[PDB]
Symmetry: D2
């Protein structure tokens, strides 16, 4: 973007703004444009636009001045060629798949996918005859194999993963896949463009659920996909039909929230790590999952491709369903609810929060234990948090 | 909704509000809830909810207090059992199709479909092996035939149509289809729940593009589908995955717009009609399309199932491309752009506006003439508009 | 504004928008600019601006692109030179007085002032040694007298009045006052720029409480003063200090509200009148206050300077406190609350609603009776409203 | 507030939210309530409210559920009894003075007042016979003298000051004034409730211009006053008339901004300091004003009552008007404009920016020099900023 702005934080702030917006104003912030359509001063011009000689969004579902800003902004951050913004994370992945994976084509994902993302791939995609292979995040062999066995159209996975924050050696995978013509999409939601640059590591496309960190205020939903033009455009097209456009007001809220992106991540990155270690050492804490810790399976990878380890920490408690429950129930600061990444701290028992619809057996089918607890550290003062968490594990 | 509320207008205003909201407040208007998630006081309750003993949206992609209002409201109007709200019309149709039509199933639609709506059905759906039969709005025979030839899963069309405002004898069609187990979905966008009750006429599902009349202010996009629970819910489920969630702020904006729905429709219904006739009589006006006119092919139907005829009026001008253009360029009140149904008056030359990507020949393939002009009458004073339009033709 | 627009409604819609905004955009609606300040490209320019060679709001408290629109719009409606926008009606009157009336100066107002507006003049202004003379709206003699007795700086009154909707022969008063150098300010809140043009009738300044009709959606507060430049500017200056700036978001909501000003008024102007007559005739209705009725004291004046009679209707019920209460309690559509002018209907018993802090005696001191009812007809269907009202006018 | 909230930051986040809102919702964020009035279910209740037996804002100008939150929030932060929120800082001071200072009363303020704030006191107040004494921030003697000479009704000043960030030994002054019955009001705008607690140091009332740090995003104006009930309430009353109500939407933006208050301040507190030092050591920098520097006149006081020194840094350059201008013009990151405290960095030449209306001589009358530059460090990366400022300074 600019030769003077070299720090991500600085960018996040003035990215796609300080230099120009395309919507001239002597205002500091971006103006929220609430329009359903864009006009023309005369048929002559309209033709020009239609003939690719002028620029216009034409219809709101195709673009918005107040949105593009955030689009370029994120683009700059991830250092991408272009970025797209849907109405929600799920939308993005959804569209992305439907757009890139041809009919009858094959795809490769990890085992630690996010609940819903899984269902889509396992129930909808097959309708299009799109088959998939589910390998473990680490198991690079399986990938290399599958790469040769079938004709992979695209490899897709989130790194860190959910909720065990498992990580994929992006650079490596990227290499393998590209050797077989496969495409690589990394859901760096948990990571954040600040703690890693999937695109830089070789990944083809990187998408985020701005609902979490980017907006980081727990008050807006939004999808987001960034990558090479020739690629992202193909999706935007399909997007222009599925109509999952993002409202301006939402867009703005994200821009504003990203004004203090670095600040928020920084703090969370710490609190988490420190709180992580503290928990691991705790007797009542059976296990702790966090890329920052040395105990983490791919810690060496995290250390190699990341600069931070997110603000989400998962850990099993030394008890059972009701016991673990007792724990979270004791907490006083975090809110018991889904989502994560906002200033407000949140906690939840995945087993119940997003898997209660299954049997104890079918649950364990995917590491989901009744002890497993997911802590999304907010931005509250560390000491305040720790004391709460501690005062909690005590009640058990 | 209420016994003491019988006129549509009165409903549109107080529908799903005057009696209660679910979010207790001594405030007149509906409060805009900007949350990305909902919390619980204790694990105990969370369980209850999960076990269907308590009520909660849980996540923002699944529901919102500031949205449900609008949901119930529209439900009340269309006199439906339950309504759903997407991020945009296109979203609705899209989902609904992908949700109801099984893989390899067959569907029946009309020829006067809206551009994009067409494409989806002709390019995406086929990927799921879903075939379709395109018949003329009037051609009831073709329908009855197709009904017996293949196994129709659902009949879908808009009434009035776009842009020739063709109308489908809903009551009749409904009967035929239901005889063969097919489902009927009517896109009464142009109609508006005020000018017609497709659901009452027997239709299974009626959907609208709130972007137009419902919001009627040209500052927000929104999809909307109403109908029976057992049905709409099946969609809501898939919607919870494709994530085309509507933002609370947008929702409210519609709630506000519908506060004066009738008032707005009423005036538009007039101006349109009156202006229509004046146009038909004009020498320079080759042809005029409008259900209100006696010249309209299905006027007898329009007169039978409708109470008004929208504010949109299409008409071919006695000239050619450049000539017709010269006309619109002369106008001083309406804006030249897509969309319609807002207080502001809008005009466009479909040929260019949304078909310029095709050849003169391929264009005519669907009645789209270079003369054809689509006038979306705003809410400005009649005389002002008339004088404008006339003074415009004055130069051709 | 333009030549093609001749009806107020048409204006209210495209006033200060259709032709240009000063904030170039190809969007239909006005963009909400959320900025606290405005920048410059270089010191050179800043100087220019400071030297009145360039244009800029500099600080938000001095202006806003999204506000000025609404400013020019109202200007056009009232046919004024320039208009100002405060945070609330009260602010307007407040500022206006503090701005024009010199220290120790004298002022003349009517007896039927709005509660608070009264207190200010009776408790604050005296601090600046500003004395006042309270005359009866009709009593033109008293005015002519005072005009000669003391040295009147400005005559200020609302027409119609609150809550007895009394009316002042603007043209006449204007003439008298100006003969003595006094200024005239009319609070045409109840009237609305559509039902009368105080400025055209000679008034110096006309102010409204956009909180009511202009916004007409019961979801925003706003002051508003229109008049000649040389005058209004003197107020804007003081305004730039008292800092009662109006928020952009608020401004927009008004502009949006005014997009259907005529439509709403028109309907209310009817419902009220019709309902009024019906009420007068009713046996349980002791008295009815409404300029539209022939029974109204200044009906001949109303008929001469207005074109409509608002939507507010006051009337005493044939009972007492508890009885009148029983009436309003029976109503099902209107909301028991202050304010008025919104699509939603509202009712209140001034005696309690805004005078319960006084004694039964001190209350009657100003016509406020325990029977007095103030009905602010919404936009709901007439029949629906009437049925309701009657259904109550019988449970007594 | 609560127990589990000991750190300011933690408070700023969950202050007046985590435990309850008064507007029940299972939502994380506070819901924006856009209403102009509040209703009642029956006359009976209304009476209750009017008789102080129930609670209700009645009218929007008197309160809003979405506002009170921010109110209590700030209250908690400053550790006050109650807080009030105006439409803009200026409004606050304005109302505050007009509300507390009786007619003919006397007041004492410092010489480094903010431009506008000065004028009001020097032009309006005198209309109410309110005389004032202007002493230097440090000159306690003058204060102690005035205290005995006349009958001071209230001592008012800002600390730090603008733009020389001078500081007042709050504790001391408070002690003296309270001995003579005077009231103390501190404008801790520059400080921020995080860098100092005027109320704790003894001050009677502390006010802020949320337009700056509190909102910290340069997209909203808002005044704010906190202090003891018996006091603040007296202001809220007059405020209920001058009608300088703050809009809900605006209120929310602040609430959202304060979600990361500490984070923001922290960073700015550093950058400023560090940058300060660097500047002072610079050869081209003639002088530097910052409470954090040892060179600062009241550094020992700042060090004793503050924990931080804001992000605002003033410094004179070794050149002249045109030279200093050349400097700021060279800057690439900060915007040249008024205001300060938002994530975006801002610079300005007080001489021109807010004193160009005066003569070179009348300007110097108050330390305002053509070299004087006020830098409000944003949140961008330090190195990024430094490099800029540096590269800037060289141009000379
Ligand atoms: C890695 C990842 N990717 C994509 C999404 C979907 O993005 P969207 O929500 O903006 O559409 C989510 C959602 N994550 C959660 C939301 C879950 C909803 P559920 O808890 O299953 O009802 C969560 O709790 O962590 C996620 O964790
Ligand atoms: C009956 C009907 N239904 C549903 C939709 C789509 O709803 P959505 O836009 O909210 O997704 C439309 C769009 N109609 C138009 C919009 C077109 C977009 P274009 O102007 O072709 O780029 C139009 O003819 O003006 C329509 O005419
Ligand atoms: C003619 C008129 N002018 C100016 C104002 C004050 O402007 P603002 O409200 O926008 O600040 C009012 C308020 N009127 C009412 C509001 C009253 C509030 P209360 O009932 O005293 O609590 C009413 O008659 O219902 C009014 O009726
Ligand atoms: C200490 C202090 N107090 C109160 C106010 C007024 O609050 P409000 O702005 O929210 O009404 C200001 C304004 N400060 C500035 C605003 C100046 C306006 P200008 O552009 O100089 O006319 C500034 O430091 O640049 C201030 O610095």
């Amino acid at each position: 973007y600019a030769s003077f702005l070299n720090s991500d934080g600085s960018v996040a702030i003035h990215a796609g703004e300080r230099l120009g917006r395309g919507i001239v104003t002597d205002a500091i912030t971006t103006p929220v444009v609430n329009t359903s359509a864009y006009f023309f001063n005369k048929t002559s011009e309209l033709i020009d636009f239609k003939e690719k000689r002028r620029a216009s969004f034409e219809y709101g579902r195709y673009g918005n001045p107040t949105t593009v800003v955030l689009e370029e902004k994120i683009s700059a951050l991830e250092g991408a060629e272009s970025t797209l913004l849907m109405a929600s994370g799920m939308c993005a992945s959804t569209v992305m798949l439907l757009a890139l994976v041809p009919a009858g084509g094959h795809i490769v994902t990890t085992t630690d996918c996010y609940r819903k993302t899984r269902i889509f791939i396992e129930t909808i995609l097959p309708k299009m005859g799109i088959t998939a292979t589910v390998i473990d995040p680490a198991d690079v062999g399986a990938l290399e194999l599958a790469l040769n066995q079938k004709k992979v159209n695209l490899f897709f996975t989130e790194s860190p993963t959910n909720p065990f924050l498992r990580c994929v050696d992006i650079e490596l995978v990227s290499k393998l896949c590209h050797e077989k013509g496969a495409l690589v999409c990394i859901d760096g939601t948990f990571a954040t463009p600040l703690n890693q640059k999937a695109l830089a590591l070789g990944a083809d496309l990187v998408l985020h659920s701005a609902t979490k960190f980017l907006g980081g205020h727990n008050d807006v939903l939004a999808g987001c996909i960034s990558g090479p033009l020739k690629l992202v455009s193909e999706i935007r097209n399909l997007h222009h039909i599925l109509g999952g456009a993002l409202n301006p007001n939402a867009a703005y809220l994200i821009i504003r929230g990203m004004k203090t992106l670095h600040l928020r991540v920084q703090q969370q990155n710490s609190t988490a790590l420190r709180m992580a270690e503290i928990l691991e050492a705790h007797p009542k804490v059976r296990h702790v999952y966090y890329p920052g810790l040395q105990s983490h399976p791919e810690h060496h990878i995290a250390k190699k491709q990341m600069t931070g380890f997110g603000g989400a920490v998962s850990f099993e408690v030394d008890g059972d369903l009701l016991t673990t429950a007792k724990f979270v129930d004791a907490l006083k600061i975090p809110y018991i609810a889904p989502s994560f990444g906002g200033c407000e701290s949140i906690v939840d028992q995945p087993a119940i929060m997003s898997y209660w619809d299954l049997s104890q057996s079918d649950r364990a089918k995917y590491g989901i234990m009744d002890n497993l607890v997911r802590f999304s550290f907010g931005v509250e003062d560390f000491d305040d948090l720790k004391a709460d968490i501690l005062q909690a594990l005590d009640s058990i």
